[PDB]
């Protein structure tokens, strides 16, 4: 399989990001339940929270208050930012190669 590395890694980052979103949702709820006042405690809204966290939006409607909930959050942020950054890098590599040919 000799397809462009930048597109492979971009695909890998996307799949991995989806995994992080699902795992993040699960682990956040597991971490936040048991803490009085915590709102990140049911899976559907936890997945929504993971999405806005990975994109860095966030709104402030949901967020973790525990140590482990916040650690999970940081992993989600980094994975999200890295993934989108890897797509941008792949796009640049594409454009650069095509401009040489042009």
């Amino acid at each position: 399989h000799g397809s462009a590395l930048h597109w492979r890694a971009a695909g890998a980052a996307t799949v991995l990001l989806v995994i992080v979103l699902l795992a993040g949702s699960y682990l956040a709820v597991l971490a936040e339940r048991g803490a009085p006042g915590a709102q990140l405690i049911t899976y559907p809204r936890a997945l929504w929270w993971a999405c806005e966290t990975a994109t860095t939006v966030x709104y402030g409607d949901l967020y973790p208050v525990t140590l482990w909930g916040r650690l999970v959050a940081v992993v989600v942020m980094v994975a999200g930012i890295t993934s989108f950054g890897l797509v941008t890098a792949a796009l640049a590599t594409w454009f650069v190669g095509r401009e040489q040919e042009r």
Partner: antibody
Amino acid sequence: QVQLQQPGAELVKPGASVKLSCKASGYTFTSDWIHWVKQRPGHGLEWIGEIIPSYGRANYNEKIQKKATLTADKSSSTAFMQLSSLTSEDSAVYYCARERGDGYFAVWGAGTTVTVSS
Amino acid sequence: DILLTQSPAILSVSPGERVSFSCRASQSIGTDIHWYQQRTNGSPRLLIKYASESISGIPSRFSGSGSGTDFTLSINSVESEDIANYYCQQSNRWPFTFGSGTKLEIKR
């Protein structure tokens, strides 16, 4: 078919301890929580605690004194509640309930009537 | 923790009328309220989830409404099998809590 099976009754001597059971049936997911609810005669529902079988973590009501200890067994799909050092205050019906991690109690057990007496 | 207040504790109504149970939270909880029915010597049974969402198997005369702090469970044309205790439950913040309950009465 009956999703949550609980024994009908348990007789406990004052100061002793009992281990209640809740046997699960039907669809079981990784995101399932088993809750325990205490109801004294002629009174309302009181939330005791919760456990997630797929991970084993348990949380408890902090407003009340901790009398309970939640464990689970994935093999037998059974959740357990360990009530210890019981008095007459602890005499009640104890329901187990299943929550799909979306906030509500979809199904309840028939409840185990716990009587504490000598 | 979130306090849910159900007042009054007893509702008396003539057979066929529309009844409304009240549930008030000590703080805003969106629509994260669920309703349960418990008959004499029975286990609680889910009637309405997320304030207004209906459940399969539950008679269409049962409905729910409200958001924020004030929630209502309604029965269109009360009949004898509706005689029970009615509880609300919130899942907005940990820990989940229950209301104190409202008993339904029928003046036959």
